């Protein structure tokens, strides 16, 4: 049988939000000139120049 007391609930959620998928779209990424690029040892990758 349908019982109103047993069926009445309060559903709770957030009022609103925006879900984002591409996190890296939020990052402005630039790179140094290739001439100046350095390796892990802080020296230039290609030193013959």
């Amino acid at each position: 049988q349908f019982d109103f007391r047993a069926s009445m609930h309060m559903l709770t959620s957030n009022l609103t939000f925006t879900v984002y998928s591409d996190l890296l779209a939020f990052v402005s990424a630039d790179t140094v000139e290739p001439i100046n690029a350095v390796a892990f040892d802080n020296m230039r990758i290609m030193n013959e120049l």
Partner: protein, 396 residues
Amino acid sequence: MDVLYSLSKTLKDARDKIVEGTLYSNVSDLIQQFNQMIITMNGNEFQTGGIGNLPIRNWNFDFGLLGTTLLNLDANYVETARNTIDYFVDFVDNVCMDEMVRESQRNGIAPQSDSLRKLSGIKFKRINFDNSSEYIENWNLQNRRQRTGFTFHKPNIFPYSASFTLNRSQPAHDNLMGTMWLNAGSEIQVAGFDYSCAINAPANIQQFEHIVQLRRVLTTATITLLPDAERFSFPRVINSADGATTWYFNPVILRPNNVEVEFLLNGQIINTYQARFGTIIARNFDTIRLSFQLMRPPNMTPAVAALFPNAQPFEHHATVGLTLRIESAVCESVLADASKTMLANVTSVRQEYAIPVGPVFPPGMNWTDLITNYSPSREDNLQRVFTVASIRSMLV
């Protein structure tokens, strides 16, 4: 005061009515009043001060309102309401205690603590709702200069006094005539003693009078009058008036003669009871006059005649008595009484936090000292603290 009482009453109603399973319709108006109180008190900072050993406490109010969401209240709703109610009850109890421990000579009826003075602001008047208790109703009517009274069972209207008056005395204290009396709370036990049993009296009649001036006017009083005073009907050794020596009392009780109890107001004869014992009604009075006679029995059996010789020594002393018990009364001023707990509450709060003796009340809130010198300022302060105590009693 009315805002503090309204806070206390709202919290009491919330605690009593917001219960698991109760219909939404049993609390709708209560929920509205509670939310109004929450809105009014939210965002306010209160400080209950540090008079005596009472700790300084800071109160902040940021509480969410109570929803109207379930047809029958559930455990979650009651839990949230209980959290809010517990914090508010703690705040109210501390404010009441802080107010109880203060007094002022000039404006004794006005709030004294910072918390209650702040609650007297206009912004908090919205919290006010039904003021139905006896003490708050009397507070409001008195503020409006309207006639109103407190009903007391066994009112504590007589300061403690156990003393005597010797109308006839000697250094040897062997032929004495006078009166003893105990006035304690609602009881007046008086006795008149003649050692000679009125052998030399003008008509073998000795007249005794006891006058008690009440510190406040009592109205609609029911009183029990009994012929004998059992407190002064056994042998006693009594220190002299100045304490120099002691004298002996050996009462033999005789029937009081020509008893007259007069209840006087403004010096006028309001009520008069002649040879009437049992329950009597005093309409409205401020003085009691008990006039009674010791009549030497004209006819005595040989034993009775042996009790009272024609001359000294007098080893049996003829005593008449009277007991007057104010069982209930009505008074425009607050008083201590058996049934209520306001004096006990105020005194306990002041003792438990070692409140230094103020400029109004006697040390230790001694009720005998308070009533003995029941000044208008003391009356105002006592009404204030008693009303605060009655407010506190609803939650504590």
